[PDB]
Amino acid sequence: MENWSALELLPKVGIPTDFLTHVKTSAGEEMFEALRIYYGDDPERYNIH
Amino acid sequence: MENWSALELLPKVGIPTDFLTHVKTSAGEEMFEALRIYYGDDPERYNIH
Amino acid sequence: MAAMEANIFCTFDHKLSIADVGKLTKLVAAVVPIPQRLHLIKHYQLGLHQFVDHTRGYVRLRGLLRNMTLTLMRRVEGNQILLHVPTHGLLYTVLNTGPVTWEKGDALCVLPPLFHGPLARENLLTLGQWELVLPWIVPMPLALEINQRLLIMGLFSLDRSYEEVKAAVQQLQTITFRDATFTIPDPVIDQHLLIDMKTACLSMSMVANLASELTMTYVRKLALEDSSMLLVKCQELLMRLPARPQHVSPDDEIARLSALFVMLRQLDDLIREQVVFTVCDVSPDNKSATCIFKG
Amino acid sequence: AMEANIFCTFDHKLSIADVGKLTKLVAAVVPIPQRLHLIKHYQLGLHQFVDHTRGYVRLRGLLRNMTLTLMRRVEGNQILLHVPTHGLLYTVLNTGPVTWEKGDALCVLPPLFENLLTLGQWELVLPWIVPMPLALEINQRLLIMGLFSLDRSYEEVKAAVQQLQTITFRDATFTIPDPVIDQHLLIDMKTACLSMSMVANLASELTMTYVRKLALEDSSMLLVKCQELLMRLDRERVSPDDEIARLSALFVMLRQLDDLIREQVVFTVCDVSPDNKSATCIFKG
Amino acid sequence: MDARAVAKRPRDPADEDNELVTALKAKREVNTISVRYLYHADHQALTARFFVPEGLVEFEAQPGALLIRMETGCDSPRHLYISLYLLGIRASNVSASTRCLLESVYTASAARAALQWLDLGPHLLHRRLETLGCVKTVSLGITSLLTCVMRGYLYNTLKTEVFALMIPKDMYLTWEETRGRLQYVYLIIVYDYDGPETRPGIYVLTSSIAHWQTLVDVARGKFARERCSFVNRRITRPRQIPLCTGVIQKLGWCLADDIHTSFLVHKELKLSVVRLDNFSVELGDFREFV
Amino acid sequence: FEAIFGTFCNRLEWVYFLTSGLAAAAHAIKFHDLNKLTTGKMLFHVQVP
């Protein structure tokens, strides 16, 4: 539902993250709405329309 | 769906329009792909969100 | 996910003497099987030694080797080994590890080793009671002979007396191929040979059922007017028992032969071994050859 | 930069007409006995194997072992042959008697039937490129036709043979030669037929002994059905050394038939011209 | 030949300028056509183009459909190109509800003609079929054009997206608890010899086994009932000469982690499929077993 | 002898879109990102007397 490609392409501000638990545990236990995970390199960010 | 309020707010180019037949006849006989008609004054364009 | 690796590095965690490394260097371009593919593996998984088991059966070892993936050995370093997974259709150099003589143009199969000569060749990397046992690469006729001997022993074992079974196993286990003598180790009869025996019996039953009268009578009719060494040696195997064909129908003959071909393929498959290499070159000392990989 | 190629030099003088004839074949499949870098024109084609007392099946066996290659370029003093590699696409010429379709699987066969390059005693005999079902049909029909060799006296047998000879494939009809010449059968086809009949005869008597022993143990209820089928077949009609010999003979006669029993695809087609004489296909080996 | 020639590593296919650029540079002539980069110049996959009538193209609009060539037994079309979904109609393996759904989808004259031709003749099903590969494109029309790969991965023009292979859920088959890292996928057609007529089962199998004999032994273990039916027909019904109990054809290889479950939408109807994300095709021929 | 009196080739003539009088009906524009574009549209606003 979110535009993940826009997040990947646009510039970002770097911060030190402070998850209390492991980041994958926070993802797997559904700490957040609107999660996306992918492994390796996913080329879908390259197809602009 | 087309958001007509954006057309209603944003600046527009002045054109001398030329419908061969009456405008309401061309609209009623379904000449145009998408169409919006309202009477009086429609408050829709005022609630920017 | 993680794409399958083509280059595999193997490291021995046992310490290696200079003699061990010297032995390893000789093995470049040989075929070594591995059970699983990773970029970096331990030497325990390398080779056929891991499957040596109290069961000792040759048939089960043949079954296990069929499912491992084959790799060629690239050049060696200190305490490291590099293995390469070949691809179908490309050209490769391969090392003749076993004593079997190769020839130009024949097809090669991978098979568990069977002992030969004095049986003192086993110097291959004995370290920490792990041993580098490698399969044999043999030409098609020898593999066909080996499988045929095993299946014939299995079929003959049924209902025959124990002592004559021993005698038959003794005479069948030895093989002379291309002016060399080999012997099959541990020809155990068990479930693995039993399933092959069942399929062979089924295929033979269907072949006997399908075959037309023309096919059956061809040999009998030929002997009435032909005479040759091939025929007389051929008819000695058969049970001892003008005219016109009682029934002519080419369409029935065609369909019947069509089914009989499928049944013959079913019977053939259990002694056939998959061709892994096809050779067209040979070092005149028979130690190495260049082959096309397939399978 | 060049591609890898095999050079062939003609050991005969060539006229302009001959080289003009060769360049017509600039995409034909040429069989070659050995993978070798430089060869003489005698090694081209199947003419080297042709024999008077041998026939189709021995040629099939020999074609199994030969190396297939494509003629790539024709020049003065030499010919360029390219050996295809597995998994790549190539252009081949439809020298066979049958049109092709997209997706067809092709296999190579000895020719059955214009002549090409008649030199002093050598001819360029190219093989047939045929879709696989047609090759299976041809093999079966020829094998059966050889099986009727002893019975040829009767008119019914002659009619059956003539029906077997005439074969029709898509939009094409042709007749295959009779493997019986001068009322006699060639030694190779004779060996094939004898092997088939021997396998049948040996299996018929060998099967029951082992089936009745093994079916009692059977956990899949199929071997009992095999036993019953054998009993029905029988009702419609020994030293251990002899048993061993009969089993070994059964398996050795089985191995004699593998050339006829199975065949392998060499090309799979995906393109065809309206000029259909040529097509582009990927190589399988 | 010299030492520098041997030492020289081969030219990069990407740093040499192509033939058209070479000619234009040689003459120093401009052209309207953009020429610096050639598309598909580095696609290693082998593709073919197929024409198919409008009625047959349904569920093959999305990329990833398996494409089969079927014989009509006639000279006018000779061959037709159909998908695995259409074979779903004839297969006994597919459930009743899915059969009804995808029978309502293919309500066109061409699809019904394909079904009539399939059931009409006396041959077994696999003798009438030839497998082409997987499709990844569509251009719609009265006659539609499909491009199918027959050796390689499935991807669009820039490789910016890799396509999966879609198998209907009733046809999907596995025989191992924990998957091997590398999986081979096979097509199975198996015949049940009941009284009136043979009912064919159609499956797509994902397995770690590459050896033929071991795979066929596992298959014979799984399909014992059909082998019993084959022998039973051989006994009860002579002069019927059946061949085969089933055929197995290899087509492809993929990684176990790429396997997923998904659905397909067509005319607001949902079909459920198994999805092989990075599937690459590698076709074999039909090998038969008893 | 036989004689060849010259060899001739087709001197093809070139046609351009912007030179044809049919181009008068067109308003031709070049757009390098056209392949990324999905759809384009224009919107009109009319009030009647």
Nearest to E211 among C202, C209, C274 (CB): C274
Closest by alpha carbon to C172, among C156, C191, C192? Answer: C156
- DSSP helix, strand, coil percent of chain B (3-state; round to 5): 35, 0, 65
Q: How far apart are CA D141 and CA D161, in angstroms?
A: 9
SS3 state at D197: helix
Answer yes or no: are the C-beta atoms of D213 and C159 closer than 8 Å.
yes
Answer yes or no: are the C-beta atoms of C258 and D140 closer than 8 Å.
yes
Tokens describing residue C118:
């004095």
For residue F8, what are the CA distances in angstroms to F2, F3, F13? 18, 15, 15
The residue length of chain C stands at 295
Chain C: give the shortest CA distance to residue D275, in Å. 31
Closest by alpha carbon to C274, among C92, C70, C100? Answer: C70
H or E segment to which residue D259 belongs: helix D258-261
* A49 contacts F38? CB cut-off 8 A: yes
H or E segment to which residue E261 belongs: strand E259-266
Answer yes or no: are the C-beta atoms of C102 and C280 closer than 8 Å.
no
For residue C100, what are the CA distances in angstroms to C95, C139, C281, E72? 12, 8, 16, 52
User: After which residues does chain A have a break in its backbone, defined as C to next N over 2.5 Å?
Assistant: none
Q: Which residue of F has its CA nearest to A49?
A: F36
Q: How far apart are CA C233 and CA D245, in angstroms?
A: 12
CA count, 13 A, side-chain hemisphere, E21: 9
CA distance between the termini of chain F: 91
Nearest to C259 among E211, E216, E243 (CB): E243
Residues sharing a CB contact under 8 Å with residue D257, sequence separation 6 or more, in sequence order: C264, D192, D195, D196, D199
| Burial readout E179-191 (b: 16 or more C-beta within 10 A, e: otherwise) | ebebbbbbbbbbb
Q: Which residue of E has its CA nearest to D88?
A: E46
Q: Are strands C277-279 and C288-293 parallel, antiparallel or unpaired?
A: antiparallel
Residues sharing a CB contact under 8 Å with residue C174, sequence separation 6 or more, in sequence order: C181, C182, C183
Q: How far apart are CA C181 and CA E138, in angstroms?
A: 63
Tokens describing residue D138:
């041809």
Q: How far apart are CA D281 and CA D102, in angstroms?
A: 9
Question: How many other CB atoms are there within 10 angstroms of residue E272's CB atom?
Answer: 13
Residue type (1 letter), E41: A
CA distance between the termini of chain C: 24
Q: How far apart are CA E49 and CA E136, in angstroms?
A: 10
**Is the Cα dihedral C284, C290, C291, D1 positive or negative?**
negative
Chain E: give the shortest CA distance to residue C141, in Å. 19
Closest by alpha carbon to E253, among E203, E190, E210, E189? Answer: E210
Which DSSP string do the residues of D199-250 spell out, in sequence order? HHHHHHHHHHHHHHHHHTT-SSSSHHHHHHHHHHHHHH---HHHHHHHHHHH
Residues sharing a CB contact under 8 Å with residue E91, sequence separation 6 or more, in sequence order: E170, E171, E200, E201, E202
Q: How far apart are CA D222 and CA D228, in angstroms?
A: 10
Answer yes or no: are the C-beta atoms of E244 and E127 closer than 8 Å.
no
Question: How many other CB atoms are there within 10 angstroms of residue E13's CB atom?
Answer: 9
Q: Do chains B and F touch (3 or more CB pairs under 8 A)?
A: yes
Question: How many other CB atoms are there within 10 angstroms of residue E7's CB atom?
Answer: 7
Distance of CA E26 to the CA centre of its chain: 46
Closest by alpha carbon to E165, among E67, E77, E43? Answer: E67
Burial class of C155 by CB neighbour count within 10 A (0 to 12, 13 to 18, 19+): buried
Residue type (1 letter), A33: E
Q: Are strands E199-207 and E172-174 parallel, antiparallel or unpaired?
A: parallel
Answer yes or no: are the C-beta atoms of D212 and C220 closer than 8 Å.
no
Distance of CA D207 to the CA centre of its chain: 31
Answer yes or no: are the C-beta atoms of C184 and C114 closer than 8 Å.
yes
Answer yes or no: are the C-beta atoms of C230 and E212 closer than 8 Å.
no
Q: Which residue of E has its CA nearest to A48?
A: E160
Question: How many other CB atoms are there within 10 angstroms of residue E27's CB atom?
Answer: 7
- In DSSP terms, E143 is beta-bridged to E53
> Where are any strands of DSSP class E within D5-159?
6-9, 29-32, 38-40, 67-75, 78-82, 89-93, 105-109, 128-131
**Is the Cα dihedral C27, C31, C33, C36 positive or negative?**
positive
CA distance between the termini of chain E: 58
* Helix (H) and strand (E) counts in chain E: 7, 14
For residue E95, what are the CA distances in angstroms to C153, E92, E203, E224, E268? 47, 8, 13, 21, 20
Residue type (1 letter), C60: R
Answer yes or no: are the C-beta atoms of C175 and C149 closer than 8 Å.
yes
Contacts of C202 in chain D (CB under 8 A): 222-223, 226
Is C1 within 8 Å of chain E by CB? yes
SS3 state at E126: helix
Answer yes or no: are the C-beta atoms of D139 and D263 closer than 8 Å.
yes
Contacts of F37 in chain A (CB under 8 A): 49
> Which residue, among F45, F46, F47, would best test binding to B if mutated, counting the most B CBs under 10 Å from its CB?
F45
Question: How many other CB atoms are there within 10 angstroms of residue C152's CB atom?
Answer: 20
DSSP C117: T
Distance of CA D259 to the CA centre of its chain: 8
Tokens describing residue D142:
């020829």
**Is the Cα dihedral E88, E90, E94, E100 positive or negative?**
positive
Residues sharing a CB contact under 8 Å with residue D12, sequence separation 6 or more, in sequence order: D41, D119, D120, D122
Chain C: give the shortest CA distance to residue E18, in Å. 28
Residues sharing a CB contact under 8 Å with residue A32, sequence separation 6 or more, in sequence order: A26
Strand order in the sheet with C136-139: C91-95, C288-293, C277-279, C107-111, C136-139
Chain E: give the shortest CA distance to residue D17, in Å. 34
Chain F: give the shortest CA distance to residue B7, in Å. 7
Answer yes or no: are the C-beta atoms of D42 and D10 closer than 8 Å.
no
Chain B: give the shortest CA distance to residue F47, in Å. 10
Q: How far apart are CA D195 and CA D187, in angstroms?
A: 12
SS3 state at C52: coil
SS3 state at E132: strand
Tokens describing residue C104:
């130009």
With vertex at residue E217, the alpha carbon angle to CA D64 and CA E181, rounded to the nearest 5 degrees, is 90
CA count, 13 A, side-chain hemisphere, E162: 16
Question: Tokens 């057609």 appear where?
Answer: E189
* CB < 8 Å from A in window 25-44 of F: 36-38
* A48 contacts F38? CB cut-off 8 A: no
Q: How far apart are CA D138 and CA C80, in angstroms?
A: 56
Answer yes or no: are the C-beta atoms of E214 and C67 closer than 8 Å.
yes
CA distance between the termini of chain B: 17
Q: How far apart are CA C58 and CA D163, in angstroms?
A: 51
Q: How far apart are CA C198 and CA C204, in angstroms?
A: 10
SS3 state at D14: coil
Which DSSP string do the residues of E134-187 spell out, in sequence order? EE---B-SSEEEEEEEEEEE-B-TTSSSB--EEEEGGGEEE--SS--SEEEEEE
Dihedrals phi, psi of D264, to nearest 5 degrees: -120, 140
Question: Tokens 């757009």 appear where?
Answer: F31
Contacts of C261 in chain D (CB under 8 A): 140, 261
Dihedrals phi, psi of B29, to nearest 5 degrees: -80, 15
* E48 contacts D102? CB cut-off 8 A: yes
Contacts of E160 in chain A (CB under 8 A): 43-44, 46-47
Q: Do chains B and C touch (3 or more CB pairs under 8 A)?
A: no
DSSP D115: -
H runs (alpha helix) in D30-178: 56-65, 132-147, 155-165
Ramachandran bin of E184, using left for φ above 0, alpha for ψ from -120 to 50, beta for the remaining angles: beta
Tokens describing residue E110:
């061409």
SS3 state at A30: coil
Question: Tokens 């997974």 appear where?
Answer: C85
Tokens describing residue C279:
């050779």
Contacts of E159 in chain A (CB under 8 A): 43
Tokens describing residue C192:
């693995």
Answer yes or no: are the C-beta atoms of E194 and E85 closer than 8 Å.
no
Tokens describing residue C242:
């003008």
Question: How many other CB atoms are there within 10 angstroms of residue E48's CB atom?
Answer: 20
- In DSSP terms, E273 is beta-bridged to E168, E262
* CB < 8 Å from F in window 23-42 of A: none
Answer yes or no: are the C-beta atoms of D29 and D126 closer than 8 Å.
yes
Q: Are strands C180-183 and C174-177 parallel, antiparallel or unpaired?
A: antiparallel
CA distance between the termini of chain A: 17
Neighbours of chain F (3+ CB pairs under 8 A): A, B
* F46 contacts B12? CB cut-off 8 A: no
Which DSSP string do the residues of C232-290 spell out, in sequence order? HHHHTTSPP-----S---HHHHHHHHHHHHHHHHHHHHTT-----EEE----TTSSEEE
Chain E: give the shortest CA distance to residue A8, in Å. 15
Q: How far apart are CA C215 and CA C217, in angstroms?
A: 6
Q: How far apart are CA C92 and CA C71, in angstroms?
A: 11
DSSP C51: G
Answer yes or no: are the C-beta atoms of E69 and E274 closer than 8 Å.
no
Q: Are strands D166-169 and D172-175 parallel, antiparallel or unpaired?
A: antiparallel
Question: Tokens 């296909």 appear where?
Answer: D281
In SS3 terms, E26-66 reads as HHCCCCCCCCCCCCCCCCCCEEEEEEEEHHHCCCCCCCCCE
For residue C234, what are the CA distances in angstroms to D187, D201, D202, E15? 15, 11, 11, 69
Answer yes or no: are the C-beta atoms of C273 and C283 closer than 8 Å.
no
Answer yes or no: are the C-beta atoms of E226 and E245 closer than 8 Å.
yes
Residues sharing a CB contact under 8 Å with residue F34, sequence separation 6 or more, in sequence order: none
Q: How far apart are CA E58 and CA E267, in angstroms?
A: 10
Q: How far apart are CA C112 and CA C95, in angstroms?
A: 16
* B24 contacts F45? CB cut-off 8 A: no
| Solved using | cryo-EM
Question: Tokens 């493997």 appear where?
Answer: D179
Q: How far apart are CA D153 and CA C184, in angstroms?
A: 52
* CB < 8 Å from D in window 226-285 of E: 227-228, 231-232, 234-235, 283, 285
> Where are any strands of DSSP class E within C40-173?
40-42, 69-77, 80-84, 91-95, 107-111, 136-139
Tokens describing residue D27:
């995409």
- In DSSP terms, D278 is beta-bridged to D93
SS3 state at C84: strand
Contacts of E161 in chain A (CB under 8 A): 43-44, 47
Dihedrals phi, psi of C124, to nearest 5 degrees: -70, 100
Contacts of B7 in chain F (CB under 8 A): 43, 45
DSSP E190: E
Q: Which residue of C has its CA nearest to D86?
A: C89
DSSP C168: H
Tokens describing residue E190:
């198996």
The residue length of chain B stands at 49
Q: How far apart are CA C183 and CA C174, in angstroms?
A: 4
Contacts of E162 in chain A (CB under 8 A): 43
Residue type (1 letter), C136: W
* CB < 8 Å from C in window 54-83 of E: none
- In DSSP terms, B41 is beta-bridged to none
Q: How far apart are CA E118 and CA E112, in angstroms?
A: 10
- In DSSP terms, D282 is beta-bridged to D89, D268
